[PDB]
Design an enzyme around this catalytic site. Structure first.
Site, PDB file in Angstrom:
ATOM      1  N   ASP A  35      37.852  35.553  42.879  1.00 61.78           N
ATOM      2  CA  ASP A  35      38.053  36.924  43.244  1.00 61.78           C
ATOM      3  C   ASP A  35      36.900  37.733  43.039  1.00 61.78           C
ATOM      4  OD1 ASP A  35      39.483  39.255  43.063  1.00 61.78           O
ATOM      5  OD2 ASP A  35      40.546  38.894  41.050  1.00 61.78           O
ATOM      6  N   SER A 199      33.724  50.771  56.497  1.00 57.57           N
ATOM      7  CA  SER A 199      33.883  50.168  57.586  1.00 57.57           C
ATOM      8  C   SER A 199      33.595  51.470  58.814  1.00 57.57           C
ATOM      9  CB  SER A 199      35.180  49.647  58.046  1.00 57.57           C
ATOM     10  OG  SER A 199      35.414  49.338  59.045  1.00 57.57           O
TER      11      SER A 199
END
Length: 330
Positions: A35, A199
């Site tokens: 994780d 992004s």
């Protein structure tokens, strides 16, 4: 040194991925959810409340000759809607594919929340976020990657998750045969303890690429792709009949639909998520209404590039002195 281990979907939907991990002496193998959005290595154990264990494999520290109780140390992780897991702490030897850390903090659960009990396939979590998020008190503990870093050939690990198929976590090296083209690296902010990046934009199917900065985290521990509502609406608008349902809690779409791809930007590079990766199947057994893999981040407070996005890419988590994140197509 280096290590490599195969990571496997827990079910037919890729709801999460489990990777085998050897703990203690002699080894006890537990299947852990690696994780990158958290920083605790915690396990079902001989100490977990018996009615809260339902099929999971447990770590028994009393059977490990290298286990040592970390005196006075406890841990607790709270969930945005559902209770908490918590317990005590041992140090023990932990290996992933023979990559070995001695003295790793192994957080033994005394209590787990109901969603963990109800998922027999996950024996615990191995956190790979930054050690600032580790919850052990009163002495914070280091992640497996943090402890391994100095010994590794390169201070890096890579995530290569499969769609409906096994994948790979490599530590210490870049398998240049695992991706196509080049790896594009992008800047990371570690201030919130996450692999947080920006992004450069998105496209829906074959549509126009929209240049827009989308801050979010690379999180192998989150199933879906959570993005701003404008982006999510632009995607589902292209699926006849798709709509956000308040009762279900997100976008649903007719199971008969064929989903378009979704492209996200990493610098000038583009990662393409095939439409099939966005189908999470019927909302309930036998329904013809299906659950979408791209969902709004509105209630979360942060955008999350979870497994739906990450499994479309070869992802480099570069833990150099200034960390960076790399993405390649594959």
């Amino acid at each position: 040194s280096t290590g490599s281990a195969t990571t496997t979907p827990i079910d037919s939907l890729d709801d999460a991925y489990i990777t085998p991990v050897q703990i203690g002496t002699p080894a006890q193998t537990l299947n852990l959810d690696f994780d990158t959005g958290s920083s605790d290595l915690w396990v079902f154990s001989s100490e977990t409340t018996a009615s809260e264990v339902d099929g999971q494999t447990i770590y028994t520290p009393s059977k490990s000759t290298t286990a040592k109780l970390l005196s006075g140390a406890t841990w607790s992780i709270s969930y945005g809607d559902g209770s908490s897991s918590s317990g005590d702490v041992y140090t023990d030897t932990v290996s992933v594919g023979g990559l070995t850390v001695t003295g790793q903090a192994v957080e033994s659960a005394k209590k787990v929340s109901s969603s963990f009990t109800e998922d027999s396939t996950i024996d615990g979590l191995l956190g790979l976020a930054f050690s600032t998020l580790n919850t052990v008190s009163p002495t914070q503990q280091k992640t497996f990657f943090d402890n391994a870093k100095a010994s590794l050939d390169s201070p890096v690990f890579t995530a290569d998750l499969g769609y409906h198929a096994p994948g790979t976590y490599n530590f210490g090296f870049i398998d240049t045969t695992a991706y196509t083209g080049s790896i594009t690296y992008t800047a990371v902010s570690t201030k919130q303890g996450f692999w947080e990046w920006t992004s450069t934009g998105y496209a829906v199917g074959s549509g126009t690429f929209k240049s827009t900065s989308i801050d979010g985290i690379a999180d192998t521990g989150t199933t879906l792709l959570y993005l701003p509502a404008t982006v999510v609406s632009a995607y589902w608008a292209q699926v006849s009949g798709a709509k956000s349902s308040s009762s279900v809690g997100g976008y649903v779409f007719p199971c008969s639909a064929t989903l378009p791809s979704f492209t996200f930007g990493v610098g000038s590079a583009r990662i393409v998520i095939p439409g099939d990766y966005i189908d999470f199947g019927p909302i309930s057994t036998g329904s013809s209404s299906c659950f979408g893999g791209i969902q709004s981040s509105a209630g979360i407070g942060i955008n999350i590039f979870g497994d739906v996005a990450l499994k479309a890419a070869f992802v480099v988590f570069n833990g150099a002195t200034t960390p960076t994140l790399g993405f390649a197509s594959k």
